[model samples]
Target: IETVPVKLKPGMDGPKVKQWPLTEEKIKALVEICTEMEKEGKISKIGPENPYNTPVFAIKKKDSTKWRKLVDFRELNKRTQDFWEVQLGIPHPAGLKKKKSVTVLDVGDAYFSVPLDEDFRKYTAFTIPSINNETPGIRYQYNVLPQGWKGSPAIFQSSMTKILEPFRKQNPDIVIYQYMDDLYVGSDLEIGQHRTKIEELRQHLLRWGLTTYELHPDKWTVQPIVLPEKDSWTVNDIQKLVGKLNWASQIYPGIKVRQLCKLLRGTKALTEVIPLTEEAELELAENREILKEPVHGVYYDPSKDLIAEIQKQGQGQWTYQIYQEPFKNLKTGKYARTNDVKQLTEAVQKITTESIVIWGKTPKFKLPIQKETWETWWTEYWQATWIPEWEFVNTPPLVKLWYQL
Candidate 1:
């Protein structure tokens, strides 16, 4: 095998790129070696069953008595927040409030990048020479190319989108959003419709040179029901959906509302048996105040009697109070207890105000620019400012030809 030394440009911090220049003799020898390896069970046919291989090997134990097992993320309890609960209006699945089931599908890692043709040419440019003095050589003496360059992802995504556009147009009912390689499809249709959509999508992706592994027709899961049931969902449905979750708490890390709902869902069963942790207790207390206020129904004209009653009560303001008796009788150790309901009420009010602010704000949308326009603009802007030295070198030859003419 021939190895080519690739150099990195100044100020670029990333993995090094190495090239192996090929020759006809080397290619023949490599093919022979591969054939021999196949006969020895070192190489196998590529198909859906053996598309890729990830190898793991056992390491020697430091001590003969015991070996350390791998750490599993399944059993870990994660921290959660309440943003999704307020914004998406998702009630605690365990709460008495009725809620419609939502189906959430997580598409595996997908990314947009340069097309195979351009990518191969770019790679070749790294090892080949450029004849024009006006144009930079394939390998720049300065400034190294970054992996997954900014334009690459957009280009790759656009290509994939074009390939999938026909299927999406044919199946207008299916909801499809492609971010890089990850595709999220959501619909409230029946099982048959959902399954048909998934199968159609899978076949379309395969036609477009994309494939999925470890996926089945049943990979699509319905929330609130572990198994398909009659129209109505039961409490057991809620448990099965979340009970299988190993890290329910960390589902939506940065989104506070979703995290809060996740925490509430995870700890609902344990709250009565054991005193909640400080954070859980505080969150529950806040949620209770919001529930009581019913901000969604606040705007209404007061009746004459109600107005009169409000005027009779000085400022018509109500005071809040939490009885200290419950804490006093608790078996757990406690500090000083207070009869100040105002403090608790104020804390909950603040939480409600913040939740509203977070929920009301609209999310930002970033639309991508077309690739052809971007490339053209970039090339023109640079060309206008830089004059090539080749123009001066060729001027004398052109003048001599003009005199002969």
Candidate 2:
């Protein structure tokens, strides 16, 4: 792995960020991995090198079964790295405003494809406690960009940007966006174009042990937007839903995150969640589709047009009426905001509730006291779609989790 060196806060030595504990499942896997990486040379098990050290810990993928490791560099960040504050708003929420997609790179576990300053490896020494014999296990440090490390995102952004700097000079319109470590290129691609872009970039990265392993972008284009129709909720799936809701909220406002707050038991309560039913699949699909609208300013007109658009778009139609959230993130935990569902909770609750009345039986909705007022209101505004300020809770849900105690 090639290292790109960058100076950290001039004379500032790295901070001795306090380390924390990770569970056995991950410790063993990560410990074994350090050895595996050593064989490939991405990490070194033997290290006593100097300076402040940070710890890398394991984490889950939202509410599901997926697992991964992370390094907490906040202590170090505050130590001085935060010396320069930067908060880049989410990037291209861009091509996202526009359409289908092709996820080109999922660096997944095989990092080091985008290397970091190998010289700083000493400061990143993370302790992995033992499995068998004499005491605490080993210290492993990354020779590449240590994800979860405080400044790593900047480094990765630079590396990735540079990798594509050439491509940008030529075909600047070939939209590419990065979230965390993965890269998503906008839209469909011709083999020649996608292949060439990937080839040129691959020549730059060194993955799989920092020197092997890879996946082609075109290989995934054939994949469909598959929604699991009948799987029970896994902790990870729940986590994904949390993230999805959060994402949707950012775009659509008026999401009351409170109701779902009951669901946020952190990652620990993941299993406590039941398997999502087909009803949830419909809900997920509805909410799942919201991640794309935030960037485009809302500009839909009237009742006649709104219903027609909703009907024409099929699953693509905007369902819930967007409203401003009364509550702020005030640290609200589990709600989803779509269509700017930032306040999507009410919409989700209302819309989901509306869909509630007739499921498993014959179909129908209860009522909107002002369906006429709003329906009536829609005809008024010389332009803009009608906005609702009231909250509705009159419709009590028909379904119950009647469990035999």
What's each prediction's TM-score? 0.25, 0.41
- lDDT tens digits, residue span 1-405, model 2: 455565556677776764554456777666665677778767766445554567655544333454455555545544434322344222343343232333345443434555657666666677776545357547767776655453454555555666667766765556666543455554345555556666555555442222241223222221111234444566666655555455446544542333333445554754565644455455566654543234235432211111100001122222222212221111111122212221232333333221111110111222323343432222112110111123323322210101000
- Candidate 2 worst ten-residue window by lDDT: 304-313
Candidate topping TM-score: 2
Candidate-wise lDDT, in order: 0.27, 0.42
